[model samples]
Target: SVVNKYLLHNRSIMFKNDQDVERFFYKREIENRKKHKQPSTLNVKANLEKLSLDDMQVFRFNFRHQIDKKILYIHGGFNALQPSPFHWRLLDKITLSTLYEVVLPIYPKTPEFHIDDTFQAIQRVYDQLVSEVGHQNVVVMGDGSGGALALSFVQSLLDNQQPLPNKLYLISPILDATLSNKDISDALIEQDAVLSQFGVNEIMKKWANGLPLTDKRISPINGTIEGLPPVYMFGGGREMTHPDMKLFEQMMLQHHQYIEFYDYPKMVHDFPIYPIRQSHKAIKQIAKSIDEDVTQ
Candidate 1:
């Protein structure tokens, strides 16, 4: 509880309100467009291989004693900013604890690339991974907007009648890009320190790049979940996306899909990505979930 409160306070200062978030987004966009880069500075003990597919930079990390399983981690940045230090920390923990090879792609972000280009790049990476190590051995994982992309990627695979990944691990995913849920009131948006409805809606519009908000590529909540692999979703009750996350759970239930939802009432947005006491436990549970489902 104390940790949650501390994180809330920190995020509150980071973006006080909707306008503050809009300014942050535009500032980051301008800086990125000008070629100002932020180094990951990830301090982890693992074998690393870096590759690039056009503008997308893909990083693969392998552990010496790792199992045959692989994790394709999609870091969340509202589809604009680069991965932060917290993302690196979460990757480190997952590598050290689970000993699973991680494949991370620095995909094209917004204000520069649209959803079509961004999704295609991710599809190429997914196809490459599946060709190397069958989809049965890979676990698709993502947080925030990345989570939305991960789900949409799988849905596309399903539409193509292709084999699915072993599982899906979504952390506080933005289910609906439209942000049309009435339950997400102004009061809730004010409480969510890390995100504002106005800021996210604007970014989603840019990411859509003329595509309808209801298009499954932009809003995976509108996509079919009937044939999805077992889904593991983690979210904070206090976050702005909590309402849609709950609605998504209901959709999965209606479709008779297998889903395990983990809700932390006191935690802030994307709690598991941060280095807090609760994140450690969440990471452990994720490792266990990946390990437990050894059979297809």
Candidate 2:
């Protein structure tokens, strides 16, 4: 908590390089995170296991109570290289809190997992949902870079006229790859206490594979947000991705769509990993939204 408090107090100044800022955001985040307790087990009464779409080697999570509450969970990572342990304890919280069935599709990521394969993996998961649970009850949710991919995947489904998710929710989403745009790019530098633009740029470069920085999948916000599932978006005052969250909410509202946005004054990226005051508040709030949207 002291580590986070220090960064939030210095939000206005920009970092000069990755080493300088990442030591605070990335390295320190992991270090400070290690000091806290992670959930040891899922609390849900029931769950299902599925073979990875590409191979049986990889596994996915499926709740076995009711077929009504369906969610497609995409993980956060600037690319596939990033670590994401969607805690069973966390999901069990959501499942029990909402009283709904949920599924977390483990889509492949990064160099070994191309977008086409990523799309196929999710598609296969969707197919499983349809066979197991009806399509009308499904909701798509993602965080960070996974949010960008979720938006893209939803759009792909829209283009093909596939059954649409009932809603879309993003947490501290990475909506833009360039992070250099005039209207929405400055929030990270301005209010995000821990992120480094230099490090972000490097990660973006690696993911794009030298594709033009403007590529829509690599960086969303470039694409239209029309016909999106009703969205409940969130971010925090101290997270670098706040700007993208703000811009996304604005766009969603501009199109006369349903969207909800939030800000935690003292949080950085992946706030859920720690028991910081603001982050715990955020988790409860997200739990509230999930209850309201997915179950109600």
Candidate 3:
């Protein structure tokens, strides 16, 4: 708990280089994560396995219980090297709390897989999900860079006249790849515990490859948000991405779209996945949203 608290307090400001920031967190997060013995299908109550798609492989988590609601839950990372045990815990918590089947698409990472290919991978999985259940029964959710991909994937759905998910949710989303907005203050950057602006820019270049910095496909904040599904998002005051969250809030108000945002004053990025005071509060709120059956 103290380790999580300290991580949240600093927000990766101490690291000046991208590699250092990623390396530090990747190692530290692994250490901080709980160890669980991976269970076998014959012995386990949960059904956690890979679902092979035409384009990419992804993970599916269910308790083997009868289910109707589902979630296309993407993970947060510069590009997750691969699924870690930490993720299974988060998925398990969400599955138990909401009773929703979650499908996590594992896309090709940057430098290895081009940005367009990643987009195609996510979109294909979405297509599969929408076909299985009605659009209204599925929700698209992501955190950090994965959050960016989720929005871009939904934009592609709109572009093609495909059915959209029932709701859109993002956690500490990187709406701007450049982090070039004037509002992202030095104070906020320093307060952040898990991200560094300099480091993010480097990852963006690798992720974007030859794409322009302002491409709406990679940075949805550059594109239109009108006519999108109902939105719910989470961020903290200290997170660098918080500024874009505010800008998005203003844009939602200007466009007359309904959105619900929950902010934890000075928590870390991806707070919901970490065990902490604000994270618990966030999980409860997200659980409430998942349980809601009424129309907004």
Candidate 4:
């Protein structure tokens, strides 16, 4: 694929405070999901489900299709937000463009989120998926923190000896500590326009809360990946988590794990959004990879 044509000089950024970004993202983004818009090619159903947490509602939407097989997307937000527009955008495109059933579960958006609680929420969604869609035709995927959660979900499934998915996709996934991974430094971070280091540290701090920060659910490399499903991940070459992304695939491979990763440059955070550009070949590269892995 031509995706490998770009240079990958690992870059990263630091936020003054993660909650600030979270606050900005939430105020500007959350209510937008509930907005009514023009009918999209996506044949989807939207609703809310009750959760164990008080007043915690899990937003669910299904894109019905001819295929029995499906993909379950978990959205990213430093582990504090629900399914974002970007997530829905990809799901809609993938379903209409590829005609695959897609289900997205809006897990709890807890400020003092724990790896255990987040993991359980993912498990609950998977349980619902298996009971409704069956495990044989399911694929798991997400981006950023959501991608990390999806990765952790896969790891948890393996840890409990539960059934695994047919495939996994991680888009610009946040696999390691976004604030201070090995490759992170003062110079490298200043160049990262999207993520601020200060903000990332606070977010990770909030995510771990009282739990062990190094737990597998918080960071997958700390966990075992011996029996996880086949995985493919993409990361921005300038992402703070790029090093962790590299480390994750390498560590998984070192353990004889089944996984593939592609790093793309000139792509800041959320580069997949550029795929909408018909002339941009990078966009097609992603779709082709998905088709090959999930369809073949």
Candidate 5:
């Protein structure tokens, strides 16, 4: 396997061990809620703009160099966790890169919200997006577990005979929540600094909320992939989710679906969300995708 020749610094993890990583993220969740509470405050003189607070809370933001394009970004927090400041920065980056009006919905987090209710909120938001801007004008994008949401959302649209989004851009998507694939080599797993096999499985079980692992909402790769919009999937070759993401690409290819797959050899999960030279390159690709007219 060819490594990223441009890789300068190891931007994945800086931890003592797996337990250290767990503690770090546990604290992060606490901080995440605090910040969002202030921003998620819907009332008078809040931090960010709130378009809707009913059913599914929606926040709309536009870049200074605006274009006719629109993006509905789904933020990821392992499904049960709240979105952190990192996600906010990632949202801003996408807005800036594509110069588009971005709609971000704080969809119901899992464990507290069941799969059915969460799916409804997602459908509701998508319906609203299509009604306002039309499906052809919208690109649904997500990172981490949110990527799985975007994929499932498309499949649901197909199932309901509703309109699909123009495109999908997934960054280090978790297509297989089950993480059932045993093919992920130990070498690759060792290189995955951000994610641990045991830890993610625990999170997956809790987020599933007793639902079957094969359920499409939990693992979108098991869902329909044919007749969906063109997909732009990005992942780190070293990440734990890389194997499953690659499997997803294979599934799409088998169905004759259009997909653009990009891999940053040494990068870790959701690397594009970080500030680095490699992330800049990935964002440039995102800009190119938005600038193009073809979705096939």
Candidate 6:
């Protein structure tokens, strides 16, 4: 775990307060987003098809000639940025090792669009995918902020009495936008290398766009999950969001919902997407879980 230790130790950025976060987002992140548009192609074996949905774009990766299962992957960028190269690599790994055809929706992001805009676009995309492949054959997967969207989207479906996906696979989901959990101690915050509490809180506030942080659309941990499909959640203990993720797991279990949580204490946020030994094992587990018969 020397590499992971080294990676976690090399944390140079830490937001001191809201002003620092504002400067980072407005000056640096916005410019980065403008410079980095979604790539037209990925270095995967699958054939990529670009689908347009008004202002949003969706990338569909067909790995095999015959597809049995479909995965609607929502890429995470804290609701403000575009998917990084790591995200593309994770999608490639999933497509290569599984029978599922990955459908990635590059949803609307912040500084330009808010959570409501992104939610509506994701809803449209999900409904269309369900119509084409049927809900039983679809699995919703996401990492980080995308994980929150995936869970909230499913909750919305449940609220509307609509058909649900076969399963959910969430990786290091930012469950609580408010970051109000007392369990997220100063030690855990110090341990987190990628995300800073002040930075995440400010970004989420902007993403909420006047909506309350407790709103299910922004924080799905506040939503009910009694009728949700079997969920597979992965978390790293070093993440600031880990405490909320653990709380979410307990809440789901308390509601009698089926959830399988994999805890990696030494890992960092979104470790499954990283180029490390643990990521390979985590991806293998996800592929195996997708094939499991959850009906029983």
Can you give the TM-score per candidate against the true fold? 0.88, 0.74, 0.84, 0.76, 0.83, 0.90
lDDT tens readout by residue for model 4, 106-199: 5655454456676777787687767766776777878777787888888778778888887888887777654457677665555456666566
Point out where model 2 deviates above 4 Å.
2-50, 56-64, 86-89, 183-194, 277-280, 291-296
lDDT of 5 at 50: 65
**lDDT, each prediction:** 0.79, 0.60, 0.73, 0.62, 0.73, 0.81
Q: Quick one: how many clashes does candidate 5 have?
A: 0
Model 5 worst lDDT window (10 residues): 1-10
Error of 3 at 243 (Å): 0.7
Minimum summed lDDT over a 10-residue window in model 3 is located at 35-44
**lDDT tens per residue, model 1, 81-182:** 777666766787888777888888888788777898788888888887888779998889999898999999889888889778889999999888777799
Candidate 6: segments with Cα more than 4 A from true spot? 1-13, 27-42
Backbone clash numbers for all candidates listed? 0, 0, 7, 9, 0, 0
- Candidate 5 ranges beyond 4 A from true positions: 1-48, 65-67
Clashing pairs in 5: none
Best by lDDT: 6
Tens digit of per-residue lDDT, candidate 2, span 23-54 = 43454334322322223453444464544555
lDDT of 6: 0.81
The window of 10 residues in a row where model 4 has the poorest summed lDDT is 4-13
Best by TM-score: 6
Q: What TM-score does candidate 4 get on C-alpha atoms? A: 0.76
Which ranges of candidate 1 are over 4 A from the true structure? 1-26, 33-42, 65-67, 294-296
Q: For candidate 5, report its TM-score.
A: 0.83
lDDT: worst 10-residue window of model 2: 31-40
